[PDB]
Design a protein around this ligand. Structure first.
Ligand SMILES: [Mg+2]
Ligand SMILES: [Mg+2]
Ligand SMILES: [Mg+2]
Ligand SMILES: [Mg+2]
Lengths: 114, 59, 148, 210
RNA sequence: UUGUGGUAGACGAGCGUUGUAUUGGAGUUGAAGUCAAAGCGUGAGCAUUGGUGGAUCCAAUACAAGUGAGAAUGCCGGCA
RNA sequence: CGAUAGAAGAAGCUGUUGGAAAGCAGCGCGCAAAAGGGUGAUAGCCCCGUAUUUGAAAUUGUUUUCAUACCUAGCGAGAUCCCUGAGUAGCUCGGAAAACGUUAUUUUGAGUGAAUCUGCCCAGACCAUUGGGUAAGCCUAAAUACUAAUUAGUGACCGAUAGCGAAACAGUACCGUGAGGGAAAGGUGAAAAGAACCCAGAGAUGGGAGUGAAAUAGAUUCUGAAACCAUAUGCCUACAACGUGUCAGAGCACAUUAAUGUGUGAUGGCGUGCGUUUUGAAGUAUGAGCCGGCGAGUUAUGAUAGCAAGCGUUAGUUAACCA
């Protein structure tokens, strides 16, 4: 018994090529390059799915530092004024968003002054 | 699978494995060895379990 | 039993296909290692081989075959530890052919052997009887005739 | 059991026939059945396939290119497995044995259990020699017997001891059905039946064979 | 509750392909194959609709293998 | 009794989709024939066959019967009668066949060389006893090996990169002084109804017409992917350092296998490919120009181990072979 099987190979390569669309040049045409680029893209996806929560926290810190620097104290002093006194688990983003709807944030920053 | 001829003439096989063999150093030079060594080597002995695999499939 | 659905209990085991990729394991190297003599086609040198070092069989002395060129004369043997389970009296070839232990086309001599006590008397007609086997058979108030 | 005789009309007889209990076993074997059906599905294989290896192909032992200095592959011979001239490296050969073995006593166990399950399955109508006759060489009467006895879409198997000739003259043009002497029924040929007609005689034989 | 990185390498469970067997069944009211699509799966992989095409084919359980390709300065054809 | 041409050889209509129905559906029917091939699509009943029953002037095969030659037949008695395979068997020198690397047995290139039923040879050097057989002359069917060939047929064998090297005018064309080496490629449609005629053009050809179910079936002729080359809606790009993607994210344009949707993606953060072999390679180490196809742990016969099954304590189990 002889088995040729050109169906399965083409279907597999078609899936790999379909994965990489919107790629420059031949990367979406030739399969040999498409597989390399899909592998590399998924590596980058795995690394960035961690780097982005590494970075968004930093952005929230930055936009909280800026808001507090216009009241007379720094972010590195505000965190004490949440943990030790008036123990609060308000998150590190929402205290950021509260500036985009301000004058409810000022209530926070003057509440810890007690 | 033919039995190795130069083996079946040196390893008699007893009941329940335990390949049997004679001892070396008994054919040539009497004086260089001692009496204790000679009468310890006359008595035949088993094969170390390390070589048991190499020999069992060799028979 | 419905050939349209015929099933066993368990016999279909992991077939190690050696060269069909990595996901199954056993892939490009195929279990042959990396780049040795065994890796190449037809590795696995001569069965008894220590690579130049004089092998165990060559190192050891040879057993002597005293009765050279002959064959040991076989015996048909009647042990007493089992012959009790066989139900028969007047043991001989003429009945051992019937009880199928011996064969009719066998001109072979008969030996008796074994220490185990036996209850009922049996009359043996055999070619050799042990000392204590004969003793055991006679303590059962049987007899043994030693054919010549 | 209540094995009962059928007439040619399709209407049953009124006097069923009891059975010796040695035929019907209390213990069933389901592994030897499977082994028997495989060993009979094998042994039905001619195995006449063949293919040419590296050497049998009319081919060139001349080396196509010199080993070095010409920048191309090494490529010793024209008819190699990876060339398109084609030396199929392993391929199928005409010597494969394709044969399996099953201990005779295991086969008797399998036949005994398959008879036990098939012969208590409300289709094994017992038949007599009479309607083996009274059906001429014509098959129309046999088709009427099948239709009246509601056995059209089944695959009914006739088992006979004396191998009557009026019967097998019929049912030969029928692709569904088939008649066999007792010594020619196999485990596959029997557990495929899905409906069978045993003649009253062979029981005496069958009980002897276990 | 304790764990779950991993080459060589040991072990386990599995998908797919081609065909045979019996069992069901779809098909000129358009079968496989082929492209396209904004689906479903833990993966091998699997469906749905439409255009083309113009006759075979799909699922369930076993069985048998020329059974699974990105690399061999690989072979053949085509094309840059 | 066959082989070589052959003869007879049962059974169906109606409706729907339909280009054509033999499908699908309704009601029947025949069978020693529901093997197969064709017929506008898948037919048991349209045809050709098949099962079955049959038949040869001529040539040929196997067997049998009757006659016919040639060959072939048996049990005893007498007696120092004669015969019973000569450069032969042995022995020696060099070698070999035989399972044996030279050894009884067997053969022999050179040399020598006997005996005659109270005999000769043999039973692994050799002698005696016992026992077996009579060389040195010829002939011999059957079982056995093989199939390029003739006929019938089969395939869990290939299906145009396969399978014979070869599906066709293949051992051709072609290479070589010569021996020799040695390819590739098939499919309109059911049927040519092979595309009259018209326009452009020198013409091939093309565009309408025409036949046809379809001419995106048109002679480039089944299907018709990919690499590859051109055209086009939508979005972006001409101060920008780039293994070319990813995570965020605007604006823009659309609208789906209805989904926290789709295509592009100004701009931020981040980012030195894949196999191989190596202590370690982004590698200034090597392989791959790209796409498609082909292509690499099988098989026979045995050994051991694990798992499952049958059978079991005078157990278990067949091989060859025969049906
Ligand atoms: Mg390597
Ligand atoms: Mg002797
Ligand atoms: Mg790889
Ligand atoms: Mg270089």
């Amino acid at each position: 018994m002889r088995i040729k099987g050109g169906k399965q190979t083409r279907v597999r390569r078609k899936k790999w090529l379909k994965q990489a669309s919107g790629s420059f040049g031949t990367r979406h045409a030739s399969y040999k390059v498409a597989k390399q680029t899909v592998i590399q893209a998924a590596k980058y996806a795995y690394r960035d799915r961690r780097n982005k929560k590494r970075d968004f926290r930093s952005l929230w810190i930055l936009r909280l530092n800026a808001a507090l620097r216009e009241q007379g104290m720094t972010y590195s002093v505000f965190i004490n004024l949440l943990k030790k006194h008036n123990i609060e688990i308000n998150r590190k983003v929402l205290s950021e968003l509260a500036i985009k709807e301000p004058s409810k944030f000022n209530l926070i920053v003057q509440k810890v002054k007690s | 699978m033919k039995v190795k001829s130069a083996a079946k003439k040196r390893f008699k096989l007893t009941k329940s494995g335990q390949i049997k063999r004679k001892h070396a150093y008994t054919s040539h030079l009497a004086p260089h060895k001692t009496t204790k060594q000679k009468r310890h080597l006359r008595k035949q002995g088993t094969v170390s379990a390390s070589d048991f695999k190499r020999i069992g499939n060799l028979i | 039993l419905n050939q349209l659905k015929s099933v066993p209990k368990a016999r279909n085991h992991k077939t190690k296909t050696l060269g069909r990729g990595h996901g199954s394991g056993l892939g490009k190297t195929s279990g042959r290692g990396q780049k040795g003599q065994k890796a190449r086609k037809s590795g696995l040198t001569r069965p008894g081989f220590e690579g130049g070092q004089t092998p165990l069989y060559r190192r050891l002395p040879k057993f002597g075959n005293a009765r050279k060129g002959f064959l040991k004369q076989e015996w048909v043997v009647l042990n007493l530890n089992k012959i009790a389970k066989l139900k028969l009296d007047k043991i001989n070839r003429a009945s051992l052919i019937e009880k199928q232990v011996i064969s009719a086309k066998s001109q072979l001599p008969i030996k008796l052997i074994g220490h185990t006590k036996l209850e009922k008397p049996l009359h043996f007609e055999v070619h050799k009887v042990s000392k204590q086997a004969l003793k055991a058979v006679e303590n059962a108030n049987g007899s043994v005739k030693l054919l010549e | 059991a209540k094995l009962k005789l059928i007439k040619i009309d399709g209407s049953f007889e009124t006097e069923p026939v009891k059975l010796s209990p040695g035929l019907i076993a209390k213990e069933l074997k389901q592994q030897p059945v499977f082994d028997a059906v495989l060993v009979e599905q094998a042994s039905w294989r001619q195995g006449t396939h063949s293919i040419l290896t590296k050497g049998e192909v009319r081919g060139g032992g001349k080396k196509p290119y010199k080993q070095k200095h010409t920048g191309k592959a090494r490529q010793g011979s024209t008819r190699n497995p990876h060339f398109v001239g084609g030396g199929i490296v392993f391929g199928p050969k005409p010597n494969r044995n394709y044969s399996l073995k099953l201990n005779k006593k295991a086969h008797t166990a399998a036949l005994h259990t398959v008879w036990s399950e098939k012969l208590a399955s409300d289709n094994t109508h017992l038949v007599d020699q009479n309607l083996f006759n009274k059906t001429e060489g014509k098959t129309k009467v046999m088709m009427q017997f099948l239709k009246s006895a509601k056995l059209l879409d089944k695959n009914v198997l006739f088992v006979v001891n004396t191998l009557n000739t009026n019967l097998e003259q019929s049912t030969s043009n029928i692709k569904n059905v088939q008649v066999k002497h007792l010594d020619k029924v196999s485990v596959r040929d029997l557990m495929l039946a899905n409906a069978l007609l045993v003649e009253k005689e062979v029981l005496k034989a069958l009980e002897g064979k276990f």
